[PDB]
Design a binder for this molecule. Structure first.
Ligand SMILES: CC(CO)CCOP(=O)(O)OP(=O)(O)O
Ligand SMILES: CC(CO)CCOP(=O)(O)OP(=O)(O)O
Ligand code: SF4
Ligand code: SF4
Lengths: 310, 309
């Protein structure tokens, strides 16, 4: 059985930074270090940080005065940020810069009292945070998840409209939504394409090339990871059997029995060691040496704040 | 005399990457290493690289077959790139990712035969490289440097128009140009704001804060550095005397005599050691300890290609 590895895969610049922010805070200040919501959506990472003293909380009110608090890479609303600022706490913002970029545009629109439309999935922490950057009653902030949502959306002044997007969406599906938005609101303004980050675009591109060769595609990632789910869905929609797994232990013999070519990739929040273990498991299941596919080279890095340098 | 230092200042992610690309290529393949155009617009850096064996040229003709060629951080046209590929040359691209981003948009408009307008300064290498990404005769690629240029521009089809900008422009001036573009061509499409990079925006914001405190501003940067010139220009427009200098030796006493507050900053292509030397000179001229102003923390880094690490 041939094992192919998607490229790129795994850790993105934002996730590497966020994890290091927590690890260094713990290394420099010791336990406990409080973190608002999972720093990244990966159970292995979250379990590891908890084992080292990190305490994940739901609300800032749970954090004691004088403590160190970290905001997750997905971002937080202005209400959350301001609350933490008024508190006697040392705060480190692990929000990815690529998410912060979208936040600033939303705050700008709210400032001008002009309505904005966010393309994203309700309930996701990044959506909560981005929608949370808008607070002008005279304007408006709306969420759409599909063309159907656009088709039924009502706006106060479509003459002054702008749109933004979640950073981990399906490139193809988002294209459909944008097309619907421009047909419905011809004067709507936005970025050249969307706010889907380089990492999401690249990983979906890479899994597309992977799915063309592999019969089965394994995507290392947690159930609550948006970008990881998109990787698995893309493969499935291409007609291949795809599985979203947290680690090698989740692999069932039945999945790869008689399979001649199995592909493996990982969401932006999944550590490379998980992939290494998956490869090891597949090999004892008949797989050979893992073959990395040729892929677009990524060179972006986001440094942790100077204070947390180690 | 009080010495203030702007923040951020100096090296950006693209410049640091580009210089490392040349340094690494010299260590790996040895001299000589050909580089198309000054890797970054800084005399000190360029002079030093010549030392280690780097040879800077403007045309691919100047480069012998079998040689290693590196494109500068400013970028190159498709014509140059293809001319280099048609030759038996080993190529490494030090173009900054933020410049490449603009290139890709121009190529897209070219492939669709749809016109594009670039806001920038004629003759600059980045402008030549970006304009050089357009090759479809059906459409068009036009350069505008001011609102007046916009007022006199006519296109084939303004219903399918888009714009891009140089990465090192004056934030304020570019705003004026875009306002003109939108009034002239109401259906024009572009980014949310412009293509001016984070480094340029941050250094201009920082020099603005520096100038509101300093009577005189010294900008460390070479004459041909676009972004560096914009820093001195900004301070000057604020009514302060500002000088663009390559090093401490260029400082003329009269500039800071009896001056109570002098500010120092550096363009994106100027090494920190130059700033340290400038501060040292100001101190022997009566200045005290250099005080860093509070500023936007930058955290972006661009890695060199694995092939050169
Ligand atoms: C922090 C982000 C959002 O940009 C992505 C990184 O991966 P996850 O940690 O799994 O987050 P998401 O579920 O939003 O893809
Ligand atoms: C490579 C660029 C253009 O993005 C900027 C870095 O600074 P310089 O090397 O001085 O180049 P420029 O004159 O274009 O500002
Ligand atoms: S997936 Fe994209 S936006 Fe989200 S942390 Fe990673 S790099 Fe940043
Ligand atoms: S000034 Fe901006 S675009 Fe030019 S090299 Fe630096 S970071 Fe890149």
């Amino acid at each position: 059985m041939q094992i192919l590895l998607a490229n790129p895969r795994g850790f993105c610049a934002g996730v590497d930074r966020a994890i290091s922010i927590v690890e260094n805070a713990l290394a420099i200040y010791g336990a406990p270090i409080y973190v608002r919501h999972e720093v990244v959506h990966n159970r292995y990472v979250v379990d590891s940080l908890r084992e080292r003293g990190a305490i994940f909380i739901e609300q800032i009110s749970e954090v004691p005065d004088g403590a160190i608090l970290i905001f997750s890479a997905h971002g937080v609303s202005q209400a959350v940020r301001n609350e933490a600022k008024s508190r006697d706490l040392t705060v480190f913002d692990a929000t990815c810069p690529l998410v912060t970029k979208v936040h600033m545009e939303v705050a700008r629109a709210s400032r001008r009292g002009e309505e904005s439309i966010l393309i994203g999935h309700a309930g996701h922490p990044e959506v909560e945070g981005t929608m949370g950057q808008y607070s002008n009653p005279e304007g408006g902030m709306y969420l759409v998840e599909s063309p159907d949502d656009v088709w039924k959306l009502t706006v106060k002044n479509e003459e002054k409209l702008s749109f933004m997007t979640q950073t981990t969406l399906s490139v193809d599906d988002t294209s459909d939504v944008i097309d619907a938005l421009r047909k419905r609101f011809p004067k709507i303004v936005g970025p050249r394409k969307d706010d889907i980050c380089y990492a999401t675009t690249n990983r979906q591109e890479a899994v597309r090339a992977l799915a063309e060769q592999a019969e089965v595609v394994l995507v290392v990632g947690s159930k609550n990871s948006s970008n990881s789910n998109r990787l698995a869905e893309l493969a499935q929609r291409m007609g291949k059997r795809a599985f979203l797994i947290d680690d090698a232990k989740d692999i069932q013999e039945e999945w790869v029995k008689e399979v001649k070519c199995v592909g493996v990739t990982a969401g932006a929040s999944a550590p490379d060691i998980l992939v290494q273990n998956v490869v090891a498991r597949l090999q004892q299941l008949g797989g050979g040496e893992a073959i990395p596919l040729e892929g677009r080279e990524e060179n972006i890095v986001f440094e942790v704040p100077k204070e947390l340098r180690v």
